[PDB]
Paper text:
Enteroaggregative Escherichia coli is the primary cause of pediatric diarrhea in developing countries. They utilize aggregative adherence fimbriae (AAFs) to promote initial adherence to the host intestinal mucosa, promote the formation of biofilms, and mediate host invasion. Five AAFs have been identified to date and AAF/IV is amongst the most prevalent found in clinical isolates.
Here we present the X‐ray crystal structure of the AAF/IV tip protein HdaB at 2.0 Å resolution.
Numbering used by the authors:
A (entry chain B): 0 to 146
B (entry chain A): -1 to 121, 125, 128 to 146
């Protein structure tokens, strides 16, 4: 079961090169895992689907195209398997929200939503199944003496 | 999508435990959309067949109790790679039993049953609400 954080990165200017970091994220999992999986909660451009698109709110309403970035993160190219993956067995991983393609982005307020989990690689894929604490309970049974 | 699991112990007289006797009654709930349930015991395994288990008395491993998960509708995979028992119940709740596995003269004592479970989505996935977080970013120009 993962803990995820996302921290805005302030930036002056709107001629944004591809790769420019707009937020810094971290995912943590204490339990044993094969790696991490993170994704953006946003509509994708025309299917595609296309690049993650975020529309500004509470003011001018324009579009910004974003992706997850950072060393170690990989995306599966055959459609069907959403998000980015890494193979870090360590407990913590950094990722970024980055500008996806050179963009002159209109001034405004843009909300990034991301989700994430750790996964445990499975033979008989299956592939990578997510990793959460199962509900658990105990009961004690007494076997009585013979007498 | 976390399950809620209860386990009710049943009292019996004496230490001759016949195969199939229900030592505990379990119930597993999943209030969200799911294809079925999966349940297992956190105990060592005899590897006899499937879902079978060996529980030690609270005093230590010098005394064993052999048990299995039972109940209509529950299945286990024949290969060791996937553990526990599964069903294909889409309803909120599923009932299972911890049963005596084979006729046994059991050493008097206390035996702790630890049971875990999850609701799954058929797609070898468990239902785990992924952690989620937002941050707001302002785009602005100098002038």
């Amino acid at each position: 079961s993962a803990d995820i954080t996302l921290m805005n990165h302030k930036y002056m200017g709107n001629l944004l090169h591809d790769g420019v970091k707009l937020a810094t994220g971290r995912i943590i999992c204490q339990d044993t895992h094969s790696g991490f999986r993170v994704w953006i909660n946003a509509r994708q451009e025309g299917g595609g689907a296309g690049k993650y698109i975020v529309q500004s709110t509470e003011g001018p309403q324009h579009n910004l195209r974003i992706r997850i970035g950072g060393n170690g993160w990989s995306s599966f190219v055959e459609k069907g398997i959403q998000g980015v993956f890494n193979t870090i067995k360590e407990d913590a991983s950094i990722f970024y929200i980055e500008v996806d393609g050179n963009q002159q982005v209109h001034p405004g307020k843009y909300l990034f939503s991301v989700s994430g989990e750790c996964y445990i690689h499975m033979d008989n894929k299956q592939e990578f199944i997510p990793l959460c604490q199962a509900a658990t309970i105990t009961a004690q049974h007494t076997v009585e003496k013979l007498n």
